[PDB]
Amino acid sequence: SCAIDQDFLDAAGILENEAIDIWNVTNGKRFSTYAIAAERGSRIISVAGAAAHCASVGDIVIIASFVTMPDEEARTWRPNVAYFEGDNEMKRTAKAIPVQV
Amino acid sequence: SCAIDQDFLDAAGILENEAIDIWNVTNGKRFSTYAIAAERGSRIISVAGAAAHCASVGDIVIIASFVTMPDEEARTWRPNVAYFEGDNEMKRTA
Amino acid sequence: SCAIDQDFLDAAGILENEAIDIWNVTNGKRFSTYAIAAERGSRIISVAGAAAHCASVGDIVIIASFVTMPDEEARTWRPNVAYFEGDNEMKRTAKAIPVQV
Amino acid sequence: SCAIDQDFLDAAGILENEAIDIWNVTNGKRFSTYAIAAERGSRIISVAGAAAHCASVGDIVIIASFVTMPDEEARTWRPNVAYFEGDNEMKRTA
Amino acid sequence: MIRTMLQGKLHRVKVTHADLHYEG
Amino acid sequence: GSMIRTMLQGKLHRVKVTHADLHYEG
Amino acid sequence: GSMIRTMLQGKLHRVKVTHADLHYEG
Amino acid sequence: MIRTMLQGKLHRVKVTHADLHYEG
Numbered sequence: 509s510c511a512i513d514q515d516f517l518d519a520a521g522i523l524e525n526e527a528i529d530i531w532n533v534t535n536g537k538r539f540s541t542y543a544i545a546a547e548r549g550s551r552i553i554s555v556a557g558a559a560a561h562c563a564s565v566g567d568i569v570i571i572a573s574f575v576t577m578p579d580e581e582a583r584t585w586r587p588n589v590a591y592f593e594g595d596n597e598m599k600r601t602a603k604a605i606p607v608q609v
Numbered sequence: 610s611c612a613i614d615q616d617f618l619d620a621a622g623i624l625e626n627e628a629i630d631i632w633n634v635t636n637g638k639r640f641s642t643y644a645i646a647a648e649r650g651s652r653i654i655s656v657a658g659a660a661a662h663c664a665s666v667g668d669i670v671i672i673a674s675f676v677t678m679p680d681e682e683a684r685t686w687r688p689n690v691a692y693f694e695g696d697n698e699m700k701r702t703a
Numbered sequence: 704s705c706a707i708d709q710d711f712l713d714a715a716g717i718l719e720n721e722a723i724d725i726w727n728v729t730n731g732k733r734f735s736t737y738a739i740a741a742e743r744g745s746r747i748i749s750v751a752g753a754a755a756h757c758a759s760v761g762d763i764v765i766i767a768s769f770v771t772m773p774d775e776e777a778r779t780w781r782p783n784v785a786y787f788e789g790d791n792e793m794k795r796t797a798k799a800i801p802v803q804v
Numbered sequence: 805s806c807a808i809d810q811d812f813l814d815a816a817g818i819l820e821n822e823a824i825d826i827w828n829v830t831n832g833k834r835f836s837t838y839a840i841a842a843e844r845g846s847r848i849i850s851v852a853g854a855a856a857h858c859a860s861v862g863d864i865v866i867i868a869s870f871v872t873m874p875d876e877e878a879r880t881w882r883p884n885v886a887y888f889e890g891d892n893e894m895k896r897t898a
Numbered sequence: 899m900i901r902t903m904l905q906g907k908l909h910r911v912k913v914t915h916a917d918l919h920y921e922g
Numbered sequence: 923g924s925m926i927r928t929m930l931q932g933k934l935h936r937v938k939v940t941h942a943d944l945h946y947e948g
Numbered sequence: 949g950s951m952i953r954t955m956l957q958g959k960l961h962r963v964k965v966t967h968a969d970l971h972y973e974g
Numbered sequence: 975m976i977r978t979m980l981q982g983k984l985h986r987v988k989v990t991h992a993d994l995h996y997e998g
Contacts, residue, residue: 612941612948655941655942656943661942661943662944674930675930680924680927690935693934693935697940
């Protein structure tokens with residue numbers, strides 16, 4: 509379906525076999541599939557099968573998952589967001605506490 | 610993201626980070642994203658990234674959220690609706 | 704959104720303000736909105752606003768709602784289906800018990 | 805409706821009247837409907853009505869169902885997958 | 899494990915009115 | 923059961939889009 | 949919470965469509 | 975009343991591989 513470096517899944521809290529939405533920034537296509545884990549550190553985002561009609565190598569995409577919970581909990585819920593640049597390099601931060609000047 | 614003036618979110622009962630559907634009255638496009646709050650009183654309705662392929666400045670849209678509940682509750686449920694005109698001027702009724 | 708003769712809502716178990724999927728048999732478009740009640744006996748199926756880009760007067764559509772429940776219950780669940788012909792005339796049946804020959 | 809051989813439904817754990825997503829590998833179309841059982845051993849995958857605008861005889865498709873469960877359960881969950889080739893000949897592994 | 903099931907449907911109704919300016 | 927419904931919680935009806943940016947990383 | 953996930957329950961992978969009818973009322 | 979909320983996202987990742995013949 510869509511294979512994703514396990515490190516990226518860890519950061520976003522996305523599970524293997526979880527429903528995901530993929531929003532293609534490059535071409536505007538929007539679709540839903542499920543996540544599979546790619547090897548840790550591979551930095552892979554692979555699209556397979558039917559979904560390959562909706563994204564090409566080099567396209568920039570946002571991959572999201574959604575959960576349900578009662579309203580009371582939802583009021584303070586915080587999503588797990590990972591940001592990327594360049595060749596799927598995950599940005600910190602999480603900055604190191606300043607120990608040098 | 611779809612950033613939305615917090616006052617508008619309050620009136621519709623929509624939460625930050627809640628799934629929303631956007632139905633574009635102008636072009637007929639229909640998509641789903643999530644809500645983020647814009648500054649109170651800004652009157653902002655902002656689409657970013659991929660969603661900017663589906664709406665443009667000036668387009669008239671409906672932004673909806675859906676919840677789940679048991680049948681009995683559903684049968685007496687009243688949605689929170691805010692109606693707009695003009696410079697995103699909000700009213701309680703149409 | 705989409706207004707529907709209350710008699711039709713009653714038969715299908717669809718509620719005012721419930722999420723509905725509309726599948727357009729005429730043009731193949733598929734979209735999701737919410738139901739509003741039209742006057743009982745009006746035989747109205749009205750599409751409003753953005754949704755009017757997806758259906759026209761005379762198009763044949765299927766309107767569906769979905770519910771969730773645990774697997775054990777789902778195994779025997781029975782949907783509420785109403786069938787139509789002509790000018791939104793709901794078909795029986797429910798046949799009358801034969802009392803005449 | 806999407807009528808599906810009951811044997812195939814059993815292998816994938818899909819129920820009659822359950823919501824399903826259909827992803828068309830041949831044409832890239834993606835849609836959602838519900839499953840109805842076809843006769844056991846018929847090997848039928850039938851699309852009707854509106855859905856016939858999205859698939860044709862010969863198209864290769866993936867038919868999926870989704871369930872909800874708490875996080876802990878989700879983290880050890882194993883989907884029920886049936887793999888096909890040929891004349892809709894089913895296998896357990898690919 | 900919670901399933902999503904068809905609750906009900908109106909099968910092959912005809913759209914009687916359609917307009918971008920209707921409310922709802 | 924209990925059978926659970928998906929219901930319109932609320933909506934902003936006919937709001938106008940004020941900003942649209944493909945490149946806003948936000 | 950508890951926070952509820954949407955997970956792939958199962959799938960039929962690469963089945964072939966055998967019948968397609970716009971007019972089958974079924 | 976149960977809400978649907980963003981759980982998490984990967985923001986602006988690049989697709990590295992794509993093919994109709996890949997499995998999954």
